[PDB]
Design a protein around this nucleic acid. Structure first.
Lengths: 267, 236, 267, 236, 267, 236
RNA sequence: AAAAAAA
RNA sequence: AAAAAAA
RNA sequence: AAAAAAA
């Protein structure tokens, strides 16, 4: 507690982190998909001791007036009190809200979940996809853990095949399932700036002492689908550039783990 | 129908058979104590904090800790996505789970403090409250919280005119009664008892006695989960 | 205040209660039905100084998707601040919620209000019955006072005769009223365990010192439609058995008072 | 129509006739003071607590008690079941009822405390606020709270072009104006005055003067309710 | 702070107010209409340093079941935290609620916004008018500032001409706009009673020391459409009579400023 | 379409042209500091209170002030009337605006206090957050709050395949990316950076560099707004 | 001390 | 210091 | 320390 900043900063000066990770290393990652078998998709992600579960549940509903040709996606993050003594019961606080929105943006704006492929009857009946993020243990870097889990759960998702019967005019939900139209794999990569040093995948102890933080979310295609400098501090333009570039590299290493987990659950 | 064939249940369980139960203690880094339980298709995590400073002060009791319980279902834990928020049911379950755990706790050991118990139901399939109390006890013990006993819990119920042990969702859905009980097994002290349904006195009592036998077998499993943990620390 | 436990426990040891009641005696009960003439049904119940008013209001609405063949019943308990300095303004707290639910269960699960007899157009228009419980003075044993009031108010209820006109396809609400289909009379009976002794109908002073509490709700037919051990403490199996048995006995003595009140308001 | 026949109202009241009013003090065990009023089809209970400790402290005033009022309608008090919750109307009524009672109260007698007034409307039928203030005064007096005067209240209104006393629901519904007033009768001090409707200056003033005569007759009834109570204690 | 009462009372005894205003004078008034050009109508009103913005936004919606022949009007006052250190974030508190309701009443009950002239398809599609009051700086007399702004914004409002096409059965929203049917100009005039003296348009410093307050809202036609004694204190019947009479006089002086502002924005 | 003609935008702005911006400081009497900004069709007011006493105490930091930000849109600020209330978006914007302002602030100058920043958007038209941060800095400076720098902010974006400066609503609506940045211009310290859209690394970086040039020109305008204020006090 | 995104 | 039950 | 009015 503040004793910790000095130790962390000084270690950083010696090119070291408290857990012996490099500046660009993630803590060990565990991705396990399809763990909530009742849900349509799910992913348990562990970044070291940070654990987050994401469940995907889908139903059929009306699209938004403005977008009758798009299915619906909605992202909620529950910072459940059990995950952290800083997490209090109640509606999402600004941390949960920013996590949800940045992760949603990463998926939405990359069209990683293609909402256009989620229409059953244009303007009337679309697939509605709830990305429900249950943070189970907060040991730092919720943003990446939540985005990894979110996209891994979407990749894991199998949803009822739905057919609009052209003769009765009814929609029929079949037993056969199909994947969701997941077309990109955006992965947030998040850096803590501590003094003049950025360190990827900050643990809680690093988040406790960081100046500021920046999340770059990128897909397989070399595109950035979200960026969010979060908390205070300031970044130099060259730090951002570094972050973007390093993000793409780390995101790719993470995408491989995601695809592997996703594929393993089909074994 | 038929939830009771001859004399087997839909998953092949006999009338007095429990669903498969796995429990593990110490699964969370932040919580002072934690337990995870997979009880049938229930997947439930329980955390405890601490005994810890209780603010607002007004809430503090001078002679004892208070126990606070929150039972919560994750949105994706049920067939129809559950809006996050608590709801009347989860608030009542939190209440009876507190009333289930409190007697096991030697609360005067930590005056002015809170012991906060959190039960997150990650997948629900009937019996979440009894599986929650069971993981909760484990989490309390995992937290090093001095206790008079564990609390073990199990539901018995009535399906197709017959008293059975440990309903699943289907059975509870189409069932005639659900009777969760929690007990402190050592003294046979019933800390939770509910009955949702319609039973004769005799039916109800046999359900309770059955549920207790179920709770006692769950209790064996808790102790074994605790032994497991004490074998882990015995290393090296 | 804690001085009180010792006095109450010691009196209990001498087979005595602070108000000279037996262990199995209710405080004097007053049931008066039809007191809110605007409501469809109502009951003012006094258990000694505990007073609770229940109003029944009905309307017509859609049934729940899952149950197109059942009318709707909903139970709400307002622990109004005027009833007790422990009652704060705001949404129902866990006490109010548990009281509502246990009393609802007693009625629902005994089918005391037969929801199947509350359908006007299956799947589209059913009677909706609000059991609104206004606790006016909390002097202990809200659960029984609220259940007695609830069932007495339902028995008191007279609701507009409703007819589905088969020719216009409209539902017509008539002036003629009819009772609700009330078919059973579940009565919660509640015991406080104080030390090794259960005492029925605990006053506030007894609730202040009790170890725990158990409510058994039973109907005329020898059936239990709800049980709720509430608060902390622990009961022995033989205490429960005792409670169940004594419940049936006390419930029957109470049902007679309910039927009498119900009948008196028709005089 | 017609709410004024010739010259009788739907319930047979003349223009300046009050509905039947019954009031009783000391009807609650928990509250420090309480009053019940049946005013026409209004059935209203008022409770007072205490002067009592005011927490959160920040809310405390160093020189005086604060008065807090909550007016609330029970769900079953109105024709269409009212969702429990307060609502803009009940919050505004609570505000003006506080502003109606406060001047009667010698608040500096109990520095740092709260006097909490609760008005529960059990059945509503127009005039709940004035009947609430009236029962509230009684409850304050019943609480032994020192007061400069009772506050008595009554509404006058305009129906079918005519200024009348004490509207019922129907009359208020189809009426042109409703003018509740509360007064401290001894000094003719108007502590509540509202007008919902559309009146000429002359109309409005005659409504207020009428409402006051109504308030004064309600005040007689309050005093008599208090006398009643002091006769009860004079036993033995 | 309480030092202030004595100074204010004593000045009042000498026929004086802290800012040299007469007992019947408003602080300087600034009304500027049409300032939020995105809104359908708007008015920025300054009573001295009290500033309130009102925006009018309209849409088409269903009328209330009970009134299929009336458009909809709804009034909300936001006491935004920036306006005053006494204004906290959150839902409207009782001050905001009373301001909204009294101002709504002034307009509603005078039929200043004629809701009957806001029907497109009786029982199905009416104009819905939101009077959204954003109090920007609270320096006393919100009630009058908010009512002046509200009616000035309604007078400023230009809403899409709407036509029910009798052949397609659709409602068509045209580009051409028209005023709202504003037929009266109710203006609240508000007095603070300080000791035995009423003073119109109380500044915050006067509101801080007042005994009580009374608002009289009147239109061009000599009618009172709302009265609200607010806060504590007591008024004499002759003080009310004085207030009513003086209100009509001050309201008329204010109506002229409103009409002028309204007319200026059409220049 | 087309949001970029040749090479002019719908309002005639070139790709690297800002909308018309007016800013003024000291527009509120109650607030400790205030600024008003008209940036295109954005009309935004920012207020600051104080550094001031922070209650609840628990929230106090012993070494420093806390900054609290609330960004809020008035109901009538958007085309479709916005229900008052905050919403996920306004809460996230409040968060990033705090994170935008905090580094400019020498918070240890006022231990245990709050600095409360309020941004009310009176009319919205894309870029409210960057125009809000800009007015916020002005309001902080207007409050006499010691600062390392102003924070100036501007968004750049992608429309019809092209990186442009300062999107309006239409452009943001039909655009491919929006990239707000806030900077402390003196040290080129980026205190806010967001990207909503889909860009290549190169696109994103050019947007950020562009947005900064925009922020720097906004910064000139802030300084000039501050100069304006210091010329006003220099009278007499 | 509790069905979104954009504006 | 505010239309449910089941899961 | 967050689509009303009437009842």
């Amino acid at each position: 507690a503040g004793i910790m900043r000095d130790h962390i900063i000084n270690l950083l000066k010696e090119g070291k982190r408290i857990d012996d990770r490099g500046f660009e290393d993630y803590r060990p990652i565990e991705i396990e998909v399809g763990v909530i078998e009742k849900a349509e998709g799910s992913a348990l992600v562990k970044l070291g001791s940070t654990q987050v579960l994401v469940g995907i549940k889908t139903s059929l509903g009306e699209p938004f007036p403005d977008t009758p040709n798009m299915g619906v996606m909605t992202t909620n993050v529950e910072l459940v009190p059990l995950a952290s003594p800083t997490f209090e019961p109640g509606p999402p606080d600004e941390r949960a809200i920013e996590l949800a929105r940045v992760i949603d943006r990463g998926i939405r704006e990359s069209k990683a979940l293609n909402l256009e492929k989620m229409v059953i009857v244009p303007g009337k009946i679309v697939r509605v996809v709830f990305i429900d993020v249950h943070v189970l243990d907060h040991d730092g870097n919720l943003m990446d853990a939540i985005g990894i889990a979110a996209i891994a759960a979407l990749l894991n998702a199998r949803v009822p095949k739905v057919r609009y019967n052209e003769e009765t005019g009814e929609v029929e939900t079949l037993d056969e399932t199909e994947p969701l139209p997941v077309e990109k794999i955006p992965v947030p990569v998040t850096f803590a700036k501590i003094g003049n040093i950025l360190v990827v995948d900050p643990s809680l102890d690093e988040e406790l002492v960081m100046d500021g933080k920046i999340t770059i979310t990128t897909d397989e295609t070399g595109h950035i689908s979200a960026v969010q400098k979060s908390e205070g501090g300031a970044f130099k333009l060259e730090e951002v550039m570094y972050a973007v570039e390093t993000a793409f590299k780390k995101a790719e290493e993470i995408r491989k783990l995601i695809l592997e987990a996703v594929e393993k659950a089909k074994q | 129908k038929l939830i009771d064939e001859n004399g087997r249940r839909i998953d092949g369980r006999k009338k007095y058979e429990l669903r498969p139960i796995k429990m593990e203690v110490g699964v969370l880094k932040n919580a002072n104590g934690s337990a995870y339980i997979e009880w049938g298709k229930n997947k439930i995590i329980a955390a405890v904090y601490g005994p810890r400073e209780l603010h607002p002060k007004h809430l503090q009791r001078p002679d004892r800790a208070i126990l606070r319980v929150r039972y919560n279902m994750a949105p994706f834990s049920v067939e129809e996505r559950k809006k996050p928020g608590p709801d009347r049911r989860s608030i009542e379950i939190s209440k009876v789970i507190k009333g289930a755990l409190e007697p096991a706790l030697i609360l005067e050991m930590f005056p002015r403090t809170a012991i906060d118990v959190f039960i997150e139901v990650l997948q629900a399939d009937a019996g979440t409250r009894v599986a929650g109390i069971t993981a909760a006890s484990l989490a309390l013990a995992d937290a090093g919280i001095p206790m008079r006993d564990l609390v073990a819990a199990c539901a018995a119920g009535k399906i197709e005119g017959e008293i059975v042990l440990d309903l699943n969702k289907e059975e509870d859905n189409y069932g005639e009664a659900d009777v969760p009980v929690a007990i402190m097994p050592l003294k046979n002290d019933i800390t939770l008892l509910q009955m949702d349904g319609y039973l004769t006195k005799d039916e109800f009592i046999e359900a309770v006695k059955l549920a207790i036998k179920g709770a006692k077998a769950v209790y064996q499993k808790q102790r074994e989960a605790l032994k497991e943990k004490y074998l882990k620390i015995a290393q090296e």
